[PDB]
Design a binder for this molecule. Sequence first.
Ligand code: MG
Ligand code: MG
Ligand code: MG
Ligand code: NA
Length: 343
Amino acid sequence: IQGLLQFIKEASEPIHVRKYKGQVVAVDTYCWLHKGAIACAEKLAKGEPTDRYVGFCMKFVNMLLSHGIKPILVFDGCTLPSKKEVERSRRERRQANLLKGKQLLREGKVSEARECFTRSINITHAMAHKVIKAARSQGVDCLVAPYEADAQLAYLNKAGIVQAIITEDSALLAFGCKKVILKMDQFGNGLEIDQARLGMCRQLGDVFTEEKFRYMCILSGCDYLSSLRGIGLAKACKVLRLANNPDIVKVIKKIGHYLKMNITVPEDYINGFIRANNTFLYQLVFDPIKRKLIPLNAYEDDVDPETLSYAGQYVDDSIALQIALGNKDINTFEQIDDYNPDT
DNA sequence: CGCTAGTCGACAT
DNA sequence: TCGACTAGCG
Ligand SMILES: [Mg+2]
Ligand SMILES: [Mg+2]
Ligand SMILES: [Mg+2]
Ligand code: NA
């Protein structure tokens, strides 16, 4: 969600991680991976061996461990079919910046070339696994999500397994997270947002419940569904405030009326909205206790799970376990490690 | 004002 | 993995 943090900044508190001393905090590790990969973009683009991002993550991990924090590193897994568009686009951008960067290396211009290399960064599962080994070497629990780390984190937080989530993506709130810590530096200073405190935001109105908030985020334009032309956070929120009807479908079919604008709503956009909603609600996560694949939320009676392939497809529990442990590479689907949490 | 969408940014010498 | 910033539209 573009500009979500600025939109709900009144619900944020400048905190320090000491607040969660002795408690358990889950981490959106790919953020630290993207931050760490920039320091060595040149060598990553050229294919030269590098492991600085590992130590970069380990600074943060050790920082948490020093304050008595019990961290759980969560990593992005398989690509979600309901997100293939964004992945494809970002991939194209990466390739383009890579090519232009190489050409700029041929020109001798190193500044611009580096400026492209830093934008052509691609976080693989191999790097992530380097981080995993490095972390497990110091007794830090690591877990690969079946798909997006967002949903997995949301589950870990809702299940009571973790009490807070360290990330740079505020849109995690739309998944149903209770507490989210943003912009955390290497010392432990960050910005916390509580779900219950969403009432602090005046411009939200009565749109602070999970359902309405989720609707707002989707309508604003997310990674699952592009917003209608001229529709952002404020206007979607306005729609949800002015809307009295619970059935969101008719509301969206009356969005032109609610905003006093001439909006044409394609029939496919409704299906896309249902898809995005069901994706936010029932995206497959991995229960670490029972060791099995479950949706983020228990299925309702108004949904047929067979049509929810875009929210991720089920696999055997053993395979899901081996992926979650990081022993199985996402793309090759072959064993790359043989870790066992039992012995 | 508020949406777009491009730009620029994240590291670290 | 993503947000901050802004010129420009309505
Ligand atoms: Mg990826
Ligand atoms: Mg994510
Ligand atoms: Mg996200
Ligand atoms: Na939008």
